[model samples]
Target chain A: GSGNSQPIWTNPNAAMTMTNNLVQCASRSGVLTADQMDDMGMMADSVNSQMQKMGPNPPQHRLRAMNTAMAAEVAEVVATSPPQSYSAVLNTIGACLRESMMQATGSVDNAFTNEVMQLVKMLSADSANEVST
Target chain B: GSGNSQPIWTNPNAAMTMTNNLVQCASRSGVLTADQMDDMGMMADSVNSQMQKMGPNPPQHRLRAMNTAMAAEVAEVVATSPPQSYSAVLNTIGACLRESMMQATGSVDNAFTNEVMQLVKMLSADSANEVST
Candidate 1:
């Protein structure tokens, strides 16, 4: 295959990735073949690591950055209809993250977790989906 | 502004503003919001009623804390990274506005959040991505 064997979860220290995500040199070393489970293990580990490091991850960092870029592209569009839904939504999301960071032991949680859960419930509500919105 | 005296989204209390939503006269006067979107309501007759008591809140005080900390800082940084690709531009600015008397809530979490995650992922991975031979 002509594809670059590099793993796709590009954000190396994304913190949200498993600690040993294969994208790292350890994951990409030519010594291993894709047929080997190390690659998959790396991914699972990386994602789990990301979950574990959520404390350090600020999971929203990339989302915010990517969102910033996205918002810019859609600036005019959003602005034209420009959500009046600001403040509360932001506050809710902010509080959720802030509170989660505060409570986040093995995962994002808190009394506020209810709020976070609510937000997700409204948006996708599916536990397995991990949606786009 | 052809906008109704009423707020948008019809979902009362999502959280921010030029000052207030539903155009409240004061924080004490505004109402509580939620995710249940149904049977459960706010003002559960408990803890702070100061809805400056942080609004018709959960009053739970039982959630866990910082399974992380750098998260708040990093999210704040990422909050600060106003790039073009991101979805929404700002606000995760990462630190919470503590009401003069208390903390938001807690778990091993750092008390003073450093404020936002910076978009350094690309640079950090730059060298790591290079051939090591």
Candidate 2:
């Protein structure tokens, strides 16, 4: 029988599991819109894919710190803001996750930021349309 | 002489003062580079400008919540990550500020996100150049 020879940091699946857990916990607030939820799910997948591509060598402690900080930030937003402002909650989570990933991996790529910016633009446009209509 | 009739939220200067305080506190960690410091300062100015343009009617409670959450998030990042990863700290602060402003103002424009993404791209390219050299 093969022992557990794989290092934790090198296991992409671990990162994915952690990412999924973060997203799930954040979405548990139930304040996010359907589109916001979908965007978050996609962003998590994108981060996981980036992790895989970059090789899973990121520091474990940094990831843990990121998760902790992001969870607290989300909780704060959920607790303080009304449902109408929950989109900001989603944005906060996305931004925290992206920043944490960059810190953990020590690679500052635009892929995650671009994805987030696109979502922001789309949501802004949607808001504008809602107001105009 | 008439006293200051403007509410705290409408003062705009008050918000700018608080924003500057946040930026100064975060930068006092002394882990962020010059460029990172500049970016954060500029971001803070940009947010204040947006608040002024938006008429400074944002809910005081929401703004306070944002400030509290962002300050805590920045502290967490500063305490955990190494100096090399401090850019993530800056990114986290920027993201939190943007998200919280959106929540406080109920306006989700791409202006903040765009500024952040541009900085990320610039930093990523700078990192790449460093690696190549």
Candidate 3:
């Protein structure tokens, strides 16, 4: 049993994202080994998808409440998921979001909130019960 | 006799959105035929596309502003609309925007005097990436 070290495979949806970023960075540096780089380009869609999700709301205090709720929802889901694999992807995503929030709002402590964790706990416990049955 | 029954859409992106608004309304009203509803879904896509256009700046007392000319130009065009097909899903996405502006600044009539609107027009018209002659 390989410990499933495939960070990208855990949630290929987001993994593809990291791949695109690395590829773009490589190409922009005029070091386009796109074959290797292309392997990770699936994330271009992820990045574009996210950038659009974050469009109308500027990184300022404009949509603090909305972003806060979203981040909380995201964190809650992945953070408490009993599945460590899922949590790994979510944790990375949450960190990136919290970082953005920190840059804009200054401080990751204010990222999402305590309530969201409760929601995650509830979902995870439900799933756990289902698995046991 | 086609009525462009597509009032921007009926519902194709069943994500989480306002499309369900009309869907629910029609369903509740019990006036929507299944096929009719299917046909009506395109407007949902039409309107949803508005969400994705990347914005250069967040709306605010911070984002865009014209000296005194651009605002008036908008008022002029809006005031002189021809068929009004587009008319504008948002006469002023900003209109809903900051009515608080009036509450905070006082008086919609004096929302910003004719002078300010003109500046807004001139500035944006000059700057728009694709302003047809």
Candidate 4:
């Protein structure tokens, strides 16, 4: 998708599909298929890369980049038929990542996790269904 | 201050002053000194710029940039005489920004605001005093 245009979450089915995929990713321990693994890997890679690179106008750029990848992932899942809500699904994913990160005894947490959760919280808060918000 | 080196929040009085400055920034509607306005402008410009210029690893870079400016702001207030808690003072500032931005009709709230709130939340969460955390 061109940067000029919005991504699939702007659409219905795509957002639903993306939500479904994230749910699956959050649940899977080692049972994910290769393609699913690829999607998850790509998503994680993009996040990690963004975490690594820093410079001027970082917060703005990082937000845009995350949006770009998030939309891309949603599009990836649009191929499947599934029932999900983007808000809860993203919260699940954020929680999954957050819990795993929390267990690491020696790791130093930066604003990356904080920022991602804030994004999740904001999206969830604005979501039509407030159950998970 | 050098990016390679830690800023004054690593010190006692500097952190206290930074906290004091933030408290004032949060409280004042229009009574700030010229130098204070400059500091506030610089801080806001840094945040807005990072929000505008984004790419590859946005979240990570944005976090770093925000940290840089925040530390600088803390340094800016190091010359003052005031007693404060780093956590509560920051929360006050975050709340002030959050509330003001919330009221403005035309501005589209972005992840930049979300990220800052998240940062403030996390910092407060980890603070020894949990009142605002």
Candidate 5:
């Protein structure tokens, strides 16, 4: 028994699972080992399940709202997790968001498509910044 | 002397002023004349007033929410006004949105900047589509 230290897993969505794994995999000093970073594959695989439930042609405002919450949550992980882990987590989130935007807008011409791509690009660039700087 | 047919004069908001002018400029048939298209400038000038109220670091979700409501309102104008009026209204709105974004985000490198450019490009392209086909 890990005492009261373990989180109540609940129905356990991927973002939360990802956060838990990130926290678990980090050393006491918040650095990650190779084996710990490898565990992100599990998080990446589950990330799309929740996004896939969105209706085809979901409203752009609703998508923006989802993104607002997601950006905050992801930023928290990046702040606390090892710098090496930022890319993997962000890439997974970006991929999930990209698919959801495609589903929601159903057209490359739509506003949501452009907005999501901008977010992905920004996230990817930040990943590079974290590693480089 | 026109009874309550005239709008009460006030420090009128631009979007509202635009709508009123649009309604007035249309014929009994709900189609616009060349003179009506020229009047959008008055609206175009004032549209920036409210958006400029946002800080240089305006939130993306808030921008999206503004755009969603604006799109609905603009659509109402387009539906009631002439087919020719669509491009003019959209262009003015797009320009207003673009400037606001540049103000809000400050960096051409930021997410809002990209999103706004994408929107402006879409609106410009749509302008061509409306006039051509």
Candidate 6:
């Protein structure tokens, strides 16, 4: 019997679960190369640690910090990966993030979706800058 | 000298311009295969035609119609492309759409960003279904 059930996306382990799913799916689908997969795994660990470290902060503040960390990790990977692979890796991550969120909630979560899309938009801007220069 | 300039995203030819930029970026980046690029080009043409056809309708109504048409075109492409390539194609389109929007508006346009993210979320769900079954 269940007492109180927490929403999956709001759970403390949500980022870990979502990131692990992303790595697994991307690896299985061969959408990301071994190195890229490793990068994702490392990013997942960093994200988890960062979230834990910022546990006492306001949700919005923690989210901003988390996003900043993710953008930094992505930039590192982008610097090392080929141009073509850059898009592939980021997109697969985006796809898996949405899939994981859907599976967790049984529907699209607008607040979470908006957060993910904002990251996508930021990453896309960074990607375009990489392409242009 | 220009007089009373309107927002670029609100221009009559916005979709055409954005779609054209998307095709060009995707093609030049070599992100989408030839067939997928052609699919995007065809979708652009269809989007432009549909927008013109619905010219008398309200902006919101036309946008809903446009998204429906775009979704249909994306489903056709997902069917034809390799499963691994599916994420790549959709993500590249997402990236280009955002990039084009940013370029047009000189900043992130929240309304347009929300529209594009909704489309991405819809397409991601479709791709997950295709992968599952």
Give me the candidate number with maximum DockQ. Answer: 2
Model 2 chain B is weakest, by summed lDDT over 10 consecutive residues, at B1-10
* Model 3 / residue B86 / CA error / Å: 36
In order of listing, the candidates' clash counts read 46, 0, 29, 9, 1, 0
Spell out the clash pairs found in candidate 6: none
What DockQ, on C-alphas, does every prediction get?
0.02, 0.08, 0.02, 0.02, 0.02, 0.02
lDDT of 5 by residue, A1-133 (tens): 1222221222224224433433343323234333333333222322233235343443333333233233332333333334566565545444444443333333222232233334334433433125753
lDDT of 6 by residue, A1-133 (tens): 1333233434546545656776677677676655555556655765565456446442542343333233333333333446687677666656665686666555444434344444344433522125653
Task: Please write out the lDDT profile of model 3 over residues B29-93, one tens digit for every residue.
Answer: 44333432332243233224433432332222111111111222223323232334213411332
Please provide, for model 3 over A18-108, each residue's C-alpha lDDT reduced to its tens digit, 9 standing for 90 to 100. Answer: 3343344434443223222332232243234444655643332212222222322333324333375455544444344444334433434
| CA lDDT of every candidate | 0.25, 0.44, 0.31, 0.38, 0.34, 0.51
Predicted candidate 5 versus true structure: per-residue lDDT over B8-126, tens digit per residue? 11212332343333334333323433343333322232234333544443333333333322333333333334456656554544444334433433222233223333333332232
Please state the error at residue B16 of candidate 4 in Å: 27
lDDT of 4 by residue, A1-133 (tens): 1123223223223222343445455557433334434555445443444344433223432332333234334223222213354444454555544344334322313333343444334322422235853
Error of 1 at A115 (Å): 31
TM-score of chain B of each: 0.21, 0.36, 0.25, 0.35, 0.30, 0.59
lDDT score of residue A54 within candidate 2: 39
Quote each prediction's TM-score.
0.21, 0.30, 0.26, 0.27, 0.24, 0.36
* Model 6: per-residue Cα lDDT over B42-123, one tens digit each: 5576456545544744254234223323433433343345778767766776677678766655544444444444434443
Superposition error at A50 for model 4 (Å): 12
Q: What is the DockQ of candidate 3?
A: 0.02
